[PDB]
Design a protein around this ligand. Structure first.
Ligand code: ANP
Ligand code: GLA
Ligand code: CL
Ligand code: MG
Length: 509
């Protein structure tokens, strides 16, 4: 399958139908000419499977009706450049020249600037282009461009406005250079965007990109990273008397992953990697760039269970192995519930503090006193396990309530883990979850990285449903309390009932 291109002639996807026209006007106002096409990429929600992506564990995301639109115009210039315009005053106009030799544009994390994120998508698109038409792009520049950007994904909301942006850009950039007769495959799109953020210093998994790219209206996705990168859409189960609905409630606590990366995001990545390596050593194995927790799982099994072949995702076998993994964590990491010092670790790995450091603490700077290897691994394994179960549910119920509860429970377990083991929750999240559970929710948890941002709630929808009940309670018990100045409008914007949206796409003009 390819990324869908739409035209004027083309019923048009709601979102396109609804937003293009306007963006189109903005572009004219901005550049005094009509754009050539419009690239879109949505935001996303992760139903379950938090902070396991970077360990190669599979997740349960969904694309939402919030997106990023890029109106583009392709230019013929002697000395090609890129002009960036944003609908949001917050984002100032940027303009830069593309190296004539066909080299890459410098990305400097030293600065927190929106153009950086653009450059990120540019880069990946570029790299890809070089491979595709080396002839054309080897030592020559890409087309200059005029870009107008308008996103409705709330920033630092944990709904990944970041990925919606990057993906839209990568898409647009490939199209602009390949031309109209060229059609991107969702797979390539995905595959190239999944690491874009690393350029900006954030070592995340590709969950965000995978969802933005693979979303399908009315479909949830089961994203896998190994043995192969893959997204598989599915429809929720059909209940008899009810609707499966997911409600998002923004805490309104701004959480930008980059800003706190060293003590937050990136610190987690380190603890888990570290843990993976300690376990190895503790079990006398060699992991392989260091190995991850999934790596340890395969190796152990390979070395001690004689299983030659690496885990394929088979659900049943997975449940089994993870459970086991949980046992080993308990058996070997639990003595340091308090945390491992660099000393404890280095000793654990037969290292010098310097080795540990070169090898682990320098690729990305992190700040800490201790490393919580026990809890982080524990979370990872258990959260992974939770996914496998969720998938089974979503796939294989007498009473509707049987699903509500079962799935809800998993969600609740995930929240607890996130909060107690991974420590990425927050009072506001905590408060939202409590209110929701008591008022109609079956499962409540943060979504995305945590440390603020949004929450997801499994609530029975439709006529026989409780959406309004929850909404109301939240309004009265949380928002109106924590944010007295909040307006019905803002409120409305803080609570959303989500429907799976379509992923990346194109509009031609
Ligand atoms: N609408 C937008 N327009 C321009 N740049 C954007 C936009 N949305 C995101 N960006 C850039 O991408 C960065 C990351 O998105 P942001 O939402 O702020 O934080 P995040 O924690 O990385 N992701 P998330 O919380 O999941 O949305 C921002 O700080 C901007 O530099
Ligand atoms: O699950 C937490 C989530 O955090 C951010 O949203 C990252 O971009 C994702 O790759 C993922 O790790
Ligand atoms: Cl580049
Ligand atoms: Mg975030």
């Amino acid at each position: 399958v390819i990324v869908p291109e739409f035209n004027s002639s083309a019923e048009l996807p709601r979102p396109l139908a609804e937003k293009c026209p306007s963006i189109i006007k903005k572009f004219i106002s901005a550049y005094d000419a009509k754009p050539d096409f419009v690239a879109r990429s949505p935001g996303r929600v992760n139903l379950i499977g938090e902070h396991i992506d970077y360990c190669d564990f599979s997740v349960l995301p969904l694309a939402i009706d919030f997106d990023m639109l890029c109106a583009v115009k392709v230019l013929n210039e002697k000395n090609p450049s890129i002009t960036l315009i944003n609908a949001d005053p917050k984002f100032a106009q940027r303009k830069f020249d593309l190296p004539l030799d066909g080299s890459y544009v410098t990305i400097d994390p030293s600065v927190s600037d929106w153009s950086n994120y653009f450059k990120c998508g540019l880069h990946v698109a570029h790299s890809f282009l070089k491979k595709l038409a080396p002839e054309r792009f080897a030592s020559a520049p890409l087309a200059g461009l005029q870009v107008f950007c308008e996103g409705d994904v709330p920033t630092g909301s944990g709904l990944s406005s970041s990925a919606a942006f990057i993906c839209a850009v990568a898409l647009a950039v490939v199209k602009a250079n390949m031309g109209p007769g060229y059609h991107m495959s969702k797979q390539n799109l995905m595959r190239i965007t999944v690491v874009a953020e690393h350029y900006v210093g954030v070592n995340n998994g590709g969950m965000d990109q995978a969802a933005s790219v693979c979303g399908e209206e009315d479909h949830a996705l089961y994203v896998e990273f190994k043995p192969q990168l893959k997204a598989t859409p599915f429809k929720f189960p059909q209940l008899k008397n009810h609707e499966i609905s997911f409600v998002i409630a923004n805490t309104l606590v701004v959480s930008n992953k980059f800003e706190t990366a060293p003590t937050n995001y990136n610190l987690r990545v380190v603890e888990v990697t570290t843990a993976a390596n300690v376990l190895a050593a503790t079990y006398g194995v060699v992991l392989l760039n260091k190995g991850n927790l999934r790596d340890f799982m395969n190796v152990y099994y390979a070395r001690y269970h004689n299983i030659s072949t690496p885990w394929n995702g088979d659900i049943e076998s997975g449940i089994e192995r993870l459970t086991k993994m949980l046992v080993l964590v308990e058996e070997s990491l639990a003595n340091k519930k308090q945390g491992f010092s660099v000393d404890d670790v280095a000793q654990s790995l037969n290292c010098s503090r310097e080795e540990f450091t070169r090898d682990y603490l320098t690729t990305s700077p992190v700040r800490f006193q201790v490393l919580k290897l026990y809890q982080r691994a524990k979370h990872v394994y258990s959260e992974s396990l939770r996914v496998l179960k969720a998938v089974k549910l979503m796939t294989t119920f007498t009473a509707d309530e049987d699903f509500f509860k079962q799935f809800g429970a998993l969600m609740n377990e995930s929240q607890a883990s996130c909060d107690k083991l991974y420590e990425c929750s927050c009072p506001e999240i905590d408060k939202i979850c409590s209110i929701a559970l008591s008022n109609g929710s079956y499962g409540s948890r943060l979504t995305g990285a945590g440390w603020g941002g949004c929450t997801v709630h499994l609530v029975p929808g439709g006529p026989n449903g409780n959406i309004e009940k929850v909404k109301e309670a939240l309004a009265n018990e949380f928002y109106k309390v924590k944010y007295p100045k909040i307006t019905d409008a803002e409120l409305e914007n803080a609570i959303i009932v989500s429907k799976p949206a379509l992923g990346s796409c194109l509009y031609e003009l």
